[PDB]
Amino acid sequence: GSNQQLNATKKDKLQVIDWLIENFPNAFFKKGNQVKPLKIGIFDDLIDFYERLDTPPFSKKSLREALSYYSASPAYLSCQKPDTARVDIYGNEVDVVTPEQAKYAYQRYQERYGNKKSQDLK
Numbered sequence: 001g002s003n004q005q006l007n008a009t010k011k012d013k014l015q016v017i018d019w020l021i022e023n024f025p026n027a028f029f030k031k032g033n034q035v036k037p038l039k040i041g042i043f044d045d046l047i048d049f050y051e052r053l054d055t056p057p058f059s060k061k062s063l064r065e066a067l068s069y070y071s072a073s074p075a076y077l078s079c080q081k082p083d084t085a086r087v088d089i090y091g092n093e094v095d096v097v098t099p100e101q102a103k104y105a106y107q108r109y110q111e112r113y114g115n116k117k118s119q120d121l122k
Helices: 012-023 042-050 060-071 074-078 099-103 105-113
Strands: none
Touching (some): 012 042
């Protein structure tokens, strides 16, 4: 019967994401395979908790830049599923990713994990 905490591993880039994931446990995911879409602008909501630290190490820039990598993960994009009802840091239910904006994730997937190109008009 004791308290527990699990921050840091290796990469500081993943550490900031892993830290925020443990800070607000109402909705987050460590493994990319089970990750899901989050509330719009959730980083702006979450960064508030980084300002609570007595000695904030990796500034807001690194935190967002690293979180950008998780939203760019293959699984996240490959799992584009609209009409899902995301959640915020407080755990409140939010609106959904629309069908056009959700499918758009495929471009981001092929951009780095593929080799396809657009066309031009006749």
